[PDB]
Amino acid sequence: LTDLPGVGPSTAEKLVEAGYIDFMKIATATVGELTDIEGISEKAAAKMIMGARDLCDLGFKSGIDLLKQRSTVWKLSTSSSELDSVLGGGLESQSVTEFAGVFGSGKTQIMHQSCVNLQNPEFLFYDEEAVSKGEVAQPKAVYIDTEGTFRPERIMQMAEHAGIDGQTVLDNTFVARAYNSDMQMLFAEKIEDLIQEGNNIKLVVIDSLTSTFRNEYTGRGKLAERQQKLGRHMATLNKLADLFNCVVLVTNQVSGHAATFRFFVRKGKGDKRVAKLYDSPHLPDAEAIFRITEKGIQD
Ligand SMILES: Nc1ncnc2c1ncn2[C@@H]1O[C@H](COP(=O)(O)OP(=O)(O)NP(=O)(O)O)[C@@H](O)[C@H]1O
Ligand SMILES: [K+]
Ligand SMILES: [K+]
Ligand SMILES: [K+]
Numbered sequence: 001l002t003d004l005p006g007v008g009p010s011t012a013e014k015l016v017e018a019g020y021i022d023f024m025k026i027a028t029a030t031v032g033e034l035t036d037i038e039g040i041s042e043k044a045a046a047k048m049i050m051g052a053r054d055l056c057d058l059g060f061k062s063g064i065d066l067l068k069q070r071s072t073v074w075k076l077s078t079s080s081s082e083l084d085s086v087l088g089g090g091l092e093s094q095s096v097t098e099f100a101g102v103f104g105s106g107k108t109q110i111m112h113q114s115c116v117n118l119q120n121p122e123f124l125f126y127d128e129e130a131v132s133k134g135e136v137a138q139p140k141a142v143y144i145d146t147e148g149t150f151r152p153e154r155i156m157q158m159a160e161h162a163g164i165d166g167q168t169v170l171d172n173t174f175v176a177r178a179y180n181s182d183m184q185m186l187f188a189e190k191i192e193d194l195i196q197e198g199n200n201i202k203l204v205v206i207d208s209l210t211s212t213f214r215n216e217y218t219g220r221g222k223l224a225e226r227q228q229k230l231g232r233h234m235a236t237l238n239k240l241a242d243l244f245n246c247v248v249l250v251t252n253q254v255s256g257h258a259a260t261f262r263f264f265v266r267k268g269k270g271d272k273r274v275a276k277l278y279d280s281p282h283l284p285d286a287e288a289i290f291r292i293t294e295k296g297i298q299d
């Protein structure tokens, strides 16, 4: 941090204690966040912010450079061929992908399957020129379970049928049981801590994304607070995905809020499942057929 203009050793101490360790967090911070540090004037606060942006080259970019920012995005396979296709490759890092679906459509399964697939290096697709091996080395997942449906047995089973060691998935997946929107939100904000603690968090799951909010703001009279709170939560999730280049997945029970990718899943005949991609920034709407068996998502 002393590389940053207007940052002495004393200021560095305060900054690291206030949670500002890397340059990006400072570069993307507001003078408010920093001034509230105490002992930090807005003069020095704005100076280090300007500095951090430069050290990270956060200015205008054109020509080929526009292609290079987009190449930092890696994708996670869903184990379903048709799904990965409709996804333009697989689940994207630096974005929030939502799987909305009717009761029992498989929302949770997809979340579990994803934590498992994260441990199979062959399932992470990326441009080895823009994303080094080290950046996706020892990947870990964070699972914020709002429903109480996280099943370690299901992780083991999905893993075994894939050849991956189940226990290895469990060792590299953090699970946080949230009982309300406050915990759900706080757990999300605390993911930054797991990273500064050395954990290469590359997958974040929120199952469910909307359960707590609906249950707490039922009275449609204070639906304003709800949208604001959830929106603040989505902002946190997106920033988290961008800065730490990881894939964020969320589920939503449906029979408005932000989400960069939106799927609606429904049950087909028996094993069959139909996921409809109905919103994304660069892809056409489309359907994907697959199934859920003892092996997880397949076909
Ligand atoms: N071990 C398994 N073997 C085969 N199928 C399984 C297994 N475990 C779960 N399933 C399938 O997964 C379905 C339920 O998946 P689930 O992910 O819980 O749907 P959901 O959308 O999350 N339901 P809900 O959260 O209540 O709205 C079951 O009813 C089973 O068909
Ligand atoms: K300095
Ligand atoms: K079923
Ligand atoms: K969108």
Ligand SMILES: [Mg+2]
Pocket: 094, 095, 096, 238, 241, 242
């Ligand atoms: Mg993004």
Ligand SMILES: [Mg+2]
Pocket: 107, 108, 147, 149
């Ligand atoms: Mg579920």
